[PDB]
Design an enzyme around this catalytic site. Structure first.
Site, mmCIF file in Angstrom:
data_model
loop_
_atom_site.group_PDB
_atom_site.id
_atom_site.type_symbol
_atom_site.label_atom_id
_atom_site.label_comp_id
_atom_site.label_asym_id
_atom_site.label_seq_id
_atom_site.Cartn_x
_atom_site.Cartn_y
_atom_site.Cartn_z
ATOM 1 N N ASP A 35 0.821 -1.205 0.000
ATOM 2 C CA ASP A 35 0.000 0.000 0.000
ATOM 3 C C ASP A 35 0.857 1.258 0.000
ATOM 4 O O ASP A 35 1.319 1.693 1.052
ATOM 5 C CB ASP A 35 -0.921 -0.012 1.228
ATOM 6 C CG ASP A 35 -1.815 1.202 1.306
ATOM 7 O OD1 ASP A 35 -2.028 1.844 0.256
ATOM 8 O OD2 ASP A 35 -2.329 1.499 2.410
ATOM 9 N N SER A 199 -0.232 15.463 -12.197
ATOM 10 C CA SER A 199 -0.437 15.084 -13.583
ATOM 11 C C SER A 199 -0.650 16.340 -14.419
ATOM 12 O O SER A 199 -1.194 17.338 -13.941
ATOM 13 C CB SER A 199 -1.644 14.154 -13.693
ATOM 14 O OG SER A 199 -1.995 13.904 -15.042
HETATM 15 C C1 LIG Z 1 -14.153 8.402 0.555
HETATM 16 C C2 LIG Z 1 -12.906 7.556 0.288
HETATM 17 C C3 LIG Z 1 -13.008 6.372 -0.436
HETATM 18 C C4 LIG Z 1 -11.882 5.584 -0.692
HETATM 19 C C5 LIG Z 1 -12.105 4.288 -1.496
HETATM 20 C C6 LIG Z 1 -10.622 6.001 -0.209
HETATM 21 C C7 LIG Z 1 -9.398 5.149 -0.473
HETATM 22 N N1 LIG Z 1 -8.656 4.819 0.495
HETATM 23 N N2 LIG Z 1 -7.627 3.867 0.260
HETATM 24 C C8 LIG Z 1 -6.723 3.617 1.213
HETATM 25 O O1 LIG Z 1 -6.709 4.167 2.309
HETATM 26 C C9 LIG Z 1 -5.683 2.592 0.871
HETATM 27 N N3 LIG Z 1 -4.383 3.283 0.733
HETATM 28 C C10 LIG Z 1 -5.649 1.471 1.936
HETATM 29 C C11 LIG Z 1 -6.983 0.834 2.256
HETATM 30 C C12 LIG Z 1 -8.071 1.376 2.851
HETATM 31 N N4 LIG Z 1 -9.022 0.471 2.973
HETATM 32 C C13 LIG Z 1 -8.619 -0.724 2.472
HETATM 33 C C14 LIG Z 1 -9.304 -1.938 2.397
HETATM 34 C C15 LIG Z 1 -8.641 -3.032 1.827
HETATM 35 C C16 LIG Z 1 -7.326 -2.901 1.344
HETATM 36 C C17 LIG Z 1 -6.648 -1.678 1.421
HETATM 37 C C18 LIG Z 1 -7.324 -0.604 1.990
HETATM 38 C C19 LIG Z 1 -10.522 7.207 0.532
HETATM 39 C C20 LIG Z 1 -9.209 7.780 1.104
HETATM 40 C C21 LIG Z 1 -11.670 7.970 0.765
#
Ligand SMILES: Cc1cc(C)c(/C=N/NC(=O)[C@@H](N)Cc2c[nH]c3ccccc23)c(C)c1
Ligand SMILES: Cc1cc(C)c(/C=N/NC(=O)[C@@H](N)Cc2c[nH]c3ccccc23)c(C)c1
Ligand SMILES: Cc1cc(C)c(/C=N/NC(=O)[C@@H](N)Cc2c[nH]c3ccccc23)c(C)c1
Length: 330
Positions: A35, A199
């Site tokens: 990650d 970007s």
């Molecule tokens: C409203 C919103 C929605 C999403 C999908 C994210 C992404 N976040 N992604 C992460 O934090 C990843 N770097 C790690 C991660 C978070 N949840 C997970 C569940 C499974 C595997 C990895 C992650 C954000 C920041 C805000």
């Protein structure tokens, strides 16, 4: 030194990628989600609340002769998506693809959120963002990459994620056979602890390129590509019947559609994401509405170049004194 490990999609949609990691002595192999958007190496363990474990492989520090409790240390992480985990900390030997770090902080989960429990294929996360984001208290710990860096032939790692196929994480070297053309390097800001870059713009399908600065993070741990609402609307406007659904939680489109590509700029270079990469399949089993792989970042507070974007490129995470990011087509 160097390391090289294969990373494998967890499912038919490339929802995430898992990479085997050896922890402890004798080795306990866990499949971790590498990650670049976080800086904690945490694992399901013998300490994880039993009702919150559902099929994951666990780390049992008591069975590792090299494990040592890091006295008084705890950790707690709240990801922006609403997921979370927390627990205590051991140091132990950790190896990835032949590259070994001794004394790595391995954060043992006592609690994880439902999202993690439900992901039976993910045994933990291995953070590859900057160590300033590490959550261990009262003594912040270093990432695996930061610990390995001085020993590596070159202070870099690369992400080569596959579309519906395995790919590779390399540490310490750039595999010049793994990409086409040249690698274009671009500036990174470490001010928020992420691999944050700008970007130079975008195009939709065969349309003209729009030169515009888009600041975002390169995040291997996020599935989708999250961009400003203006950009995302311009993309989906080219797909007949596509619409933003508040009930589903983003843009959906008729599964009968053929999706256009999406191009993003890296300096004067261009990375093309094929339309098929943007299809995340039926919103529920049997539905003819499909979920889109490009979604609005509005309300996230930052744009996120997640796997949908990164898997279209060979990506260099250059951890030199002044970090940079490199992108090549492949
Ligand atoms: C409203 C919103 C929605 C999403 C999908 C994210 C992404 N976040 N992604 C992460 O934090 C990843 N770097 C790690 C991660 C978070 N949840 C997970 C569940 C499974 C595997 C990895 C992650 C954000 C920041 C805000
Ligand atoms: C780590 C990870 C990330 C994502 C975005 C999914 C998608 N799930 N979307 C769904 O609709 C599952 N019901 C999964 C399964 C795992
Ligand atoms: C990171 C993330 C973001 C969103 C907006 C959803 C909601 N999804 N709502 C649904 O109805 C899903 N079943 C749609 C869906 C189908 N395939 C996917 C693959 C990844 C993410 C969502 C879906 C989820 C689950 C995860």
């Amino acid at each position: 030194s160097t390391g090289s490990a294969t990373t494998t999609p967890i499912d038919s949609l490339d929802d995430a990628y898992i990479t085997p990691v050896q922890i402890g002595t004798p080795a306990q192999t866990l499949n971790l989600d590498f990650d670049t958007g976080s800086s904690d190496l945490w694992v399901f363990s013998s300490e994880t609340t039993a009702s919150e474990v559902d099929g994951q492989t666990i780390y049992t520090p008591s069975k590792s002769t090299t494990a040592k409790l890091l006295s008084g240390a705890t950790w707690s992480i709240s990801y922006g998506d609403g997921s979370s985990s927390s627990g205590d900390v051991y140091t132990d030997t950790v190896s990835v693809g032949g590259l070994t770090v001794t004394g790595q902080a391995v954060e043992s989960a006592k609690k994880v959120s439902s999202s993690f429990t439900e992901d039976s294929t993910i045994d933990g996360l291995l953070g590859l963002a900057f160590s300033t984001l590490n959550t261990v208290s009262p003594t912040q710990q270093k990432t695996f990459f930061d610990n390995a860096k001085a020993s590596l032939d070159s202070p870099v790692f690369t992400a080569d994620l596959g579309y519906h196929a395995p790919g590779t994480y390399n540490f310490g070297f750039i595999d010049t056979t793994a990409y086409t053309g040249s690698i274009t390097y671009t500036a990174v800001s470490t001010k928020q602890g992420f691999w944050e870059w700008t970007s130079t713009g975008y195009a939709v399908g065969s349309g003209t390129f729009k030169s515009t600065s888009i600041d975002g993070i390169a995040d291997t741990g996020t599935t989708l590509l999250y961009l400003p609402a203006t950009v995302v609307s311009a993309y989906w406007a080219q797909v007949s019947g596509a619409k933003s659904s508040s009930s589903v939680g983003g843009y959906v489109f008729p599964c009968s559609a053929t999706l256009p590509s999406f191009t993003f700029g890296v300096g004067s270079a261009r990375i093309v994401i094929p339309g098929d990469y943007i299809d995340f399949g039926p919103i529920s089993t049997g539905s003819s509405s499909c979920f889109g792989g490009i979604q609005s970042s509005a309300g996230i507070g930052i744009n996120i170049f997640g796997d949908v974007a990164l898997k279209a490129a060979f990506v260099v995470f250059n951890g030199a004194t002044t970090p940079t990011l490199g992108f090549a087509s492949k």
